[PDB]
């Protein structure tokens, strides 16, 4: 039995040089810290983070107002409370102290999702200490999962970039590699790292040294015009690295970015100077293109294949490929219960991309994960473009028994601290853990 | 008081995706962790790392051997010792357990510079805890410096890359910006981040979206042909940010990369295809070229202006710039006492670039810093190309009261990791600390 003795927040910088919020919760057991990744300050479905909007500081991206919220609103309301009452603390902040609710659920507009999550994670971390348990086992406790035979997740490393993250012709946003065939996660990380360096070398020699400079998530943005060229580089790299058959491929289309709202078309050539009518596809036809790549390449997962509001296409694609392939819903679900329930009723997808700061609290993150799992869906915990030194999602993925996680390329320490944390988790557990492997989407 | 109960180590990944060692020293006061950055497994001056060299694991960069060394050689030797005796522990490893050496001091080859530094830093963290002091203050007591009016360092952020780190025409390796005009470290960081983003979008318009991708240290590699083109971008970036006069420039030439041994001349166009742009320059002319830029642009520091062994030039350059510009030694010194002493005698520099894993231990890192400081030189704590999420050098630079630190651009968390740590330290100390500012070369004393 411990209680919240103090709560102080501060402004720190995320992986991209932009301010983010870090919180320190104190109990008789010590000081507990949590740093929140970056999200969206404006939006219609997701939880909005509070930013100063002062052009004279950090180009308007400061979080001082957020720091003051924690001190002036959240602190006085939590002093004396038991940090182990995760649900009580999260619902107090979200429903009572804030209460700002849009038509899709609580927005967390007044206090800001960033201020709330910071406290939620810090209390969650203080609670684990109060119970004398490592973070991963404590999360499992909150989710109703068991603390033995915990599943280590399959990591999804970003490798090739397109869409709005590159000047190349590639329309899809991300191409990743996933070592499902590794015996354990420490090896999974090696397979990933080696294949990644091999790919770097290939790019260095073909596209030049400057093409080996990385993007926000640590991936490369070589001058490839089509998905086929991207997919070809990956298969060559995997084979050359010696992991043919042990490392699979996955991609994030981010189709919303190339969707033509009125005519209801998807323009695979939205970046090309000379436009081709043959590439302005309807949902049903875009589907067939993906189905073409699935039979030709070892693709095991597809994220945001269509616009965030095109449930028709999602449903059709999932109906055709759902059994043997994973269809992740990111922008379409936005880690939102109501959005998920609608997806479930329409069988839009079969996997939830879980961005914790997108929903705002740990309790809400957990219920969303549980809803997906109870419905037969898989769950992939995700990082953000703007991450931090905090490895929370690493313990989260293990505690929620997802057996699946994408947290960037094996490059840039905001991505690696998560992967490093997973390896420590694995040592600690030792024989008391198993690797998701081929069962990443539905762990045993 | 408390003693060492156990020492373990594991293999983690550094910022470039290469393995490195992480050590956990345990006492009754808890478990203390330390991760070391990348170094070099070969060289004739510096402390050498121990790499597995296994053709089939991590391209020969594994560190399982280093991890086993800690377990079978170090651990048994340290169990029961007080973690506070930093010097006793550091010398037990460097001189007795290891003992290997070259004509420039102990190399730390048998146990590995990485295994020893990992242990040294972990114990240092355990010692701080024993004494009941934050790591930075504990380091101050080891260096024999006061813990009352501590000094925050001026940060040197990487911004434009060249030489071997870029396919562009720029011969110099790094260009940095330093907010000497900021009132405190948190402001210095803001100034840096703002100027960095202003630079980012200037580059975006003139070179395109791909040109904004970052290198190992978070900086950019725009296709600029000369130093003049690079300096103009920085001047422009600084003015757009509104910090003209408050943010100065610095650069690391890494001149060794463009020195022609056979000719004994430097080539600023060594990357150009056609090789007749301009004749190669001697130390003399190269100096004049730098002095030329010192008048043109607000450059306050120059690192590795000449070849790793060209003391004649260094001396000549340091002599006529003297009090108005900082001249850092990196490759020429390689954080080696005996090298520092030769450079001191020859007046080759007026500042030391301190790379803690290059010398091997915290104790040696401290005497190196103390040797520089008491001889009229500055000390600039530095990061490595391959960093980790360990913010140790943040507390080191504060504890040593250096007044200056380079730890990458305000991009990539292995870099922000250190900058964020400096801001926490500043909060902790509150009204009980000062910003080096204008005095970054030699922080003013307290009275």
CA dist., res. A153 & res. A147, Å (int) = 15
Quick one: resolution in A? 2.8
According to the entry, how was the structure determined? X-ray
Residue bearing tokens 């169990």: B79
Residue A104: strand, helix, or coil: coil
Contact B299, B251 (CB under 8 A): yes
CB distance B167–A208 less than 8 Å? yes
Q: Which residues of A touch B209 (CB under 8 A)?
A: 166-167
d(CA B380, CA B406): 7
Q: What CATH code would you report for B133-447? A: 3.20.20.120
Q: Is A54 on the interface with B (CB under 8 A)?
A: no
Mutate to test the interface with A, among B64, B412, B414, B427 (most CBs of A within 10 A): B412
Contact B17 A416 (CB under 8 A): yes
Rounded CA gap, A259 and A257, in Å? Answer: 6
C-alpha B281/C-alpha B268 separation (Å) is 8
Determine how β-strand B150-152 pairs with β-strand B154-155: unpaired
Distance CA B371, CA B337 (A): 8
Q: Quick check: A166 and A224 in contact, CB under 8 A?
A: no
- Report d(CA A343, CA A372) in Å as an integer: 10
Whether A1-132 shares its CATH topology with A133-444 is answered no
B167 touches chain A (CB under 8 A): yes
Tell which residue, B39, B30, B29, B4, has the closest CA to residue B115. B39
Question: Tokens 């709202």 map to which residue?
Answer: A261
Going by C-beta distance under 8 Å and a sequence separation of 6 or more, which residues neighbour residue A66?
A9, A11, A21, A49, A50, A51, A112, A114, A115
Q: Which helix (H) or strand (E) holds B178?
A: strand B174-178
Give me the residue label for tokens 């055709």: A320
Does residue B395 contact residue B409 with C-beta atoms inside 8 Å? no
Which residues lie below 8 Å from residue A47, measured CB to CB, with a gap of 6+? Answer: A39, A106, A107, A108, A113, A357, A358, A359, A360
Q: B413-429 vs B185-207: helix axis angle to the nearest 10?
A: 150
Selection from A325, A407, A397, A412 nearest residue A365 by Cα: A397
What is the Cα Rg of chain B in Å? Answer: 21
Q: Is B53 a catalytic residue?
A: no
Q: What Rg value do the Cα atoms of chain A yield, rounded?
A: 21
Q: Is B330 annotated as a binding residue?
A: yes
Per CATH, the number for A133-444 is 3.20.20.120
CB atoms within 10 A of CB A257: 19
Contact A420 B389 (CB under 8 A): yes
B385 is in an annotated binding site: yes
**β partners of residue B281:** B266
Backbone dihedral region for residue B335 (phi beyond 0: left; psi -120 to 50: alpha; all else: beta):
left
The rounded distance, in Å, linking the Cα atoms of B320 and B328 is 15
Buried b (16+ CB within 10 A) or exposed e, B278-311: eebbebeebbeebeeeeeebbbbbbbbbbbbebb
Three-class DSSP category at A147: coil
Residues linked to residue B178 through DSSP beta bridges, in sequence order:
B248
Read off φ and ψ for residue B111, nearest 5 degrees: -85, -30
> What whole-number distance in Å separates Cα of residue B124 and Cα of residue B142?
10
A215 touches chain B (CB under 8 A): yes
For B287, the enclosing helix (H) or strand (E) is: helix B283-296
Detail the DSSP E strand segments found in A120-196.
150-152, 154-155, 157-161, 174-178
CA–CA separation, A305 and A251 (whole Å): 9
Domain at B1-132: CATH architecture: 2-Layer Sandwich (3.30)
Distance of CA A171 to the CA centre of its chain: 21
Half-sphere exposure in the Cβ direction for B401 (13 Å, CA): 24
Contact A167 B210 (CB under 8 A): yes
Domain boundaries, chain A: 1-132, 133-444
**Which of B12, B17, B24 best tests the A interface by mutation, with the highest count of A CBs <10 A?**
B17
Residue A280 marked ligand-binding: no
Closest C-alpha to B198, from B210, B216, B212, B182: B212
Shortest alpha-carbon distance between residue B272 and chain A (Å): 15
Do the beta carbons of residue B148 and residue B432 sit within 8 Å? yes
- Tokens (6 digits) for A328: 């992740």
Would an 8 Å CB–CB cutoff place B340 in contact with chain A?
no
Residue from B175, B184, B174 nearest B154 by CA: B184
**Of A184, A215, A177, A183, which is closest to residue A199 (Cα–Cα)?**
A177
DSSP string of B98-122? Answer: I--EETTEE--TTT-HHHHHHHHHH
- Alpha-carbon distance of A178 to A362, in angstroms, equals 26
Contact in structure between B83 and B130 (CB atoms under 8 Å)? yes
Contacts across the A-B interface (CB distance below 8 Å): 124
- Helix (H) / strand (E) element for B150: namely strand B150-152
**How many helices and strands in chain A, by DSSP H and E?**
14, 19
CB contacts under 8 A, A 11-40 vs B, are: 11-18, 22
């Amino acid at each position: 039995m411990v209680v919240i003795k103090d709560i102080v927040a501060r402004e720190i910088l995320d992986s991209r040089g932009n301010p983010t919020i870090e919180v320190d919760v104190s109990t008789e057991g010590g000081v507990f810290r949590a740093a929140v990744p970056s999200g969206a300050s404006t939006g219609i479905y997701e939880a909005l983070e509070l930013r100063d909007k002062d052009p004279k500081r950090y180009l308007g991206k400061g979080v001082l107002n957020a720091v003051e919220i924690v001190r002036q609103e959240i602190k006085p309301a939590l002093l004396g409370k038991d940090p182990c009452d995760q649900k009580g603390i999260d619902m107090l902040m979200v429903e009572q102290l804030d209460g700002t609710k849009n038509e899709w659920g609580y927005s967390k507009s007044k206090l800001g999702a960033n201020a709330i999550l910071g406290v939620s994670i810090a209390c969650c971390r203080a609670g684990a200490a109060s119970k004398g348990l490592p973070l991963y086992k404590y999360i499992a406790t909150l989710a109703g999962k068991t603390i033995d035979k915990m599943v280590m997740p399959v990591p999804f490393f970003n490798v090739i970039n397109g869409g709005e993250h590159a000047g190349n012709g590639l329309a899809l946003q991300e191409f990743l590699i996933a070592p499902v065939g590794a015996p354990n996660i420490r090896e999974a990380i090696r397979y990933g790292s080696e294949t990644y360096h091999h790919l770097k070398n290939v790019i260095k020699n073909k596209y030049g040294l400057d093409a080996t400079n990385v993007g926000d998530e640590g991936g490369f943005a070589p001058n490839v015009a089509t998905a086929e060229e991207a997919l070809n580089l990956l298969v060559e790299a995997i084979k050359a690295a010696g992991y043919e058959g042990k490392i699979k491929i996955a991609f994030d289309a981010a189709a919303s970015e190339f969707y033509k709202q009125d005519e209801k078309k998807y323009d695979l050539d939205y970046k090309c100077k000379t436009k081709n009518a043959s590439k302005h596809l309807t949902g049903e036809k875009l589907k067939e293109v993906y189905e073409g790549w699935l039979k030709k390449y070892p693709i095991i997962s597809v994220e945001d294949p269509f616009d965030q509001d095109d449930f028709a296409s999602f449903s059709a694609f999932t109906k055709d490929v759902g059994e043997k392939t994973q269809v992740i819903g990111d922008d379409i679900l936005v880690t939102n219960i109501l959005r998920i329930e609608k997806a479930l009723k329409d069988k839009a997808c079969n996997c939830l991309l879980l961005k914790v700061n997108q929903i705002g609290s740990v309790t809400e993150a957990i219920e969303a994960c549980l809803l997906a799992q109870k419905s037969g869906w898989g769950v992939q915990v995700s990082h953000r473009s703007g991450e931090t030194e905090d490895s929370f999602i690493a313990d989260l993925v293990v505690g929620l028994r997802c057996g699946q996680i994408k947290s960037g390329s094996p490059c840039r320490s905001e991505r690696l601290c998560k992967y490093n944390q997973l390896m420590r988790i694995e040592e600690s557990l030792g024989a008391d853990c198993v690797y998701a492997g081929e069962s990443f989407r539905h762990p045993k």
